[PDB]
């Protein structure tokens, strides 16, 4: 056989990135999104709205966050 | 345009185009070096970047070399990409763009680098000075551009369409079938070149004997002798070269290099002794010429020089079939001399 030309065509890009960049990056970037959400999950554990809404719905780590003070012993 | 190829059952082929455009035929000196460094650049159709990138995707390598007679445009590829590289060499022979913006940016720094590299070796300076004192303005133009005579872009264009004519060039190659190469060189733009005159003239190029040049140079010192040889006495000096730089002599430990440059019309047998000390260059070249002025017998070196010339004419496309069996002896007559380096501690031509 004999190839007289080059039978090839441009990719999809915007100069700095391309689709081949994001295709190979996207599993590690969704893992980075999960790691960032985990980071602020652990950074906002003392926030009481996220504490009583989400951080006791955890199955076995739940009853460690609340501590059972009787209501007739707090000042407010 | 003579297409001369051969076949082999292998994978990698080469296609070469040889023009007669070295510094033998340069009008101003250094023009052929600028054309050789100028060769594989921007064509009027595609770039020097698109050609290199799509040929690397197709799997090949372009090159362009320059010696005293030819400019060689070589292309080494996988075997099933012949018509693309034929069309690429025809493109780059016909319609290079010749822009000043790439003359200053890309050609002149490469020429300056190649000239500095060939200057810092003290044996190439002796060799081209030996050429310049043997042949005055025939083969004795300098090989590389150095900024002495200012070369424009118009001189490069005039020399390029003087030398890139159809009767001047010929196309050879390894591992291509001759039928497809002769069918691809036609139906191309290599056939539509101007059919100018061929540039080679075949009578002997008017040498000069008994001349000396002394070049001052810091570093290591060389002493070179050089004999211009005819076409009939080419075999005796080839046997002499392969006898002198070989273990048959006792003069192989003194001679650092010795070689016969062959051409169509005649040749030049050159001999370099290089050292860092210079009294050893003086005593060595005195012993060399004082032993070569007596008669040496050259018939023991015949089988060895047949071997060496078979292995050196292996891959060249210009085989000269020398006989090597009318050779019996050698006695040195008159010879040109050039002494480069520590020049005051080197012997003159009257001392040798």
From Swiss-Prot, chain A:
Per the UniProt entry, the signal peptide is none
Give the highest taxon in the source lineage: Eukaryota
Further information: Present with 5590 molecules/cell in log phase SD medium.
Which membrane topology describes this protein? Single-pass membrane protein
**Pfam families given in the database record:** QCR10
Query: Can you name a GO cellular component term?
Result: mitochondrial inner membrane
Quote the function comment for this protein: Component of the ubiquinol-cytochrome c oxidoreductase, a multisubunit transmembrane complex that is part of the mitochondrial electron transport chain which drives oxidative phosphorylation.
Q: What is this protein called?
A: Cytochrome b-c1 complex subunit 10, mitochondrial
Q: Tell whether Transmembrane is among the UniProt keywords.
A: yes
Could you list this entry's UniProt keywords, alphabetically sorted: Electron transport, Membrane, Mitochondrion, Mitochondrion inner membrane, Respiratory chain, Transmembrane, Transmembrane helix, Transport
Q: Where in the cell is it found?
A: Mitochondrion inner membrane
**Into which family does the record put it?**
Belongs to the UQCR11/QCR10 family.
Q: What is its main location?
A: mitochondrion
What's a BP term from Gene Ontology annotated to this protein? aerobic respiration
Q: What quaternary structure, including any partners, is listed in this protein's UniProt entry? A: Component of the ubiquinol-cytochrome c oxidoreductase (cytochrome b-c1 complex, complex III, CIII), a multisubunit enzyme composed of 10 subunits. The complex is composed of 3 respiratory subunits cytochrome b (COB), cytochrome c1 (CYT1) and Rieske protein (RIP1), 2 core protein subunits COR1 and QCR2, and 5 low-molecular weight protein subunits QCR6, QCR7, QCR8, QCR9 and QCR10.
Q: Can you tell me where the transmembrane regions are?
A: 21-44
Mitochondrial matrix topological domain residue ranges? 1-20
What is the taxonomic lineage of the source species?
Eukaryota, Fungi, Dikarya, Ascomycota, Saccharomycotina
Q: What gene codes for this chain? A: QCR10
Lipid biosynthesis: present as a keyword of the record? Answer: no
Q: Which residues lie on this side of the membrane: Mitochondrial intermembrane?
A: 45-76
Curated annotation (Swiss-Prot), chain B:
Q: Which GO terms describe its cellular component?
A: mitochondrial crista; mitochondrial inner membrane; mitochondrion; respiratory chain complex III
Q: Which InterPro entries match?
A: Metalloenz_LuxS/M16, MPP/UQCRC_Complex, Pept_M16_N, Pept_M16_Zn_BS
Which molecular-function annotation in GO is an example for this chain? Answer: metalloendopeptidase activity
* UniProt main location, coarse: mitochondrion
Superkingdom, taxonomy of origin: Eukaryota
Any Pfam family matching the protein = Peptidase_M16
For this UniProt record, the keywords arranged alphabetically read as follows: Electron transport, Membrane, Mitochondrion, Mitochondrion inner membrane, Phosphoprotein, Respiratory chain, Transit peptide, Transport
Q: Does the keyword Phosphoprotein apply?
A: yes
**Compartment annotation:** Mitochondrion inner membrane
**Swiss-Prot/TrEMBL GO biological process terms:** aerobic respiration; cellular respiration; mitochondrial electron transport, ubiquinol to cytochrome c; proteolysis; proton transmembrane transport
The way it spans or sits in the membrane comes to:
Peripheral membrane protein
Modified sites of kind Phosphoserine: 125, 152
Quaternary arrangement and interactors, per the entry? Component of the ubiquinol-cytochrome c oxidoreductase (cytochrome b-c1 complex, complex III, CIII), a multisubunit enzyme composed of 10 subunits. The complex is composed of 3 respiratory subunits cytochrome b (COB), cytochrome c1 (CYT1) and Rieske protein (RIP1), 2 core protein subunits COR1 and QCR2, and 5 low-molecular weight protein subunits QCR6, QCR7, QCR8, QCR9 and QCR10.
Q: Which family does it belong to?
A: Belongs to the peptidase M16 family. UQCRC2/QCR2 subfamily.
Q: Which additional comment does the entry carry?
A: Present with 35700 molecules/cell in log phase SD medium.
So what does this one do? Component of the ubiquinol-cytochrome c oxidoreductase, a multisubunit transmembrane complex that is part of the mitochondrial electron transport chain which drives oxidative phosphorylation.
PANTHER family named among the record's database cross-references: CYTOCHROME B-C1 COMPLEX SUBUNIT 2, MITOCHONDRIAL (PTHR11851:SF209), METALLOPROTEASE (PTHR11851)
What's this protein's name? Cytochrome b-c1 complex subunit 2, mitochondrial
Q: Please report the organism this UniProt entry assigns to the protein.
A: Saccharomyces cerevisiae (strain ATCC 204508 / S288c) (Baker's yeast)
Supply the source organism's classification. Eukaryota, Fungi, Dikarya, Ascomycota, Saccharomycotina
The gene from which this protein is expressed is QCR2
């Amino acid at each position: 056989a004999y190839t007289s030309h080059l039978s090839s065509k441009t990719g999809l890009h915007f100069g700095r990135l391309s689709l081949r960049s994001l295709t190979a990056y996207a599993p590690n970037l969704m893992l980075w999104g999960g790691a960032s959400m985990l980071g602020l999950f652990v950074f906002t554990e003392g926030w009481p709205k996220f504490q009583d809404t989400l951080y006791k719905k955890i199955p076995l780590l739940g009853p460690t966050l609340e501590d059972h003070t009787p209501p007739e012993d707090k000042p407010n | 345009l003579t297409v001369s190829a051969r076949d082999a059952p292998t994978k990698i082929s080469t296609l070469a185009v040889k023009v007669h455009g070295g510094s033998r035929y340069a009008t101003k000196d250094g023009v052929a070096h600028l054309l050789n460094r100028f060769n594989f650049q921007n064509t009027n159709t595609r770039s020097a970047l698109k050609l290199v990138r799509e040929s690397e995707l197709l799997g090949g390598t372009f090159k362009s070399t320059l010696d005293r007679e030819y400019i060689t445009l070589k292309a080494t590829f996988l075997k099933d990409d012949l018509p693309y590289y034929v069309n690429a060499l025809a493109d780059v022979l016909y319609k290079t763009a010749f822009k000043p913006h790439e003359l200053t940016e890309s050609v002149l720094p490469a020429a300056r680098y190649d000239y500095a590299v060939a200057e810092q070796c003290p044996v190439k300076s002796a060799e081209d000075q030996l050429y310049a004192i043997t042949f005055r303005k025939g083969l004795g133009n300098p090989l590389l551009y150095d900024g002495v005579e200012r070369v424009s872009l118009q001189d490069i264009k005039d020399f390029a369409d003087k030398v890139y004519t159809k009767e001047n060039l010929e196309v050879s190659g390894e591992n291509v079938v001759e039928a497809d190469l002769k069918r691809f060189v036609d139906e191309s733009l290599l056939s539509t070149l101007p059919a100018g005159k061929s540039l080679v003239s075949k009578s002997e190029p008017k040498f000069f004997l008994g001349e000396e040049n002394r070049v001052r140079f810091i570093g290591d010192s060389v002493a070179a002798i050089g004999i211009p040889v005819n076409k009939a006495s080419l075999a005796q000096y080839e046997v002499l070269a392969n006898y002198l730089t070989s273990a048959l002599s006792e003069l192989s430990g003194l001679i650092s290099s010795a070689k016969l440059d062959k051409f169509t019309d005649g040749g030049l047998f050159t001999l370099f002794v290089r050292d860092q000390d210079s009294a050893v260059v003086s005593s060595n070249i005195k012993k060399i010429v004082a032993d070569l002025k007596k008669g040496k017998d050259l018939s023991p070196a015949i089988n060895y020089t047949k071997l060496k010339n078979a292995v050196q004419n292996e891959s060249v496309s210009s085989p000269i079939e020398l006989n090597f069996d009318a050779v019996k002896d050698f006695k040195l007559g008159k010879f040109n001399y050039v002494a480069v380096g520590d020049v005051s501690n080197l012997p003159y031509l009257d001392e040798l």
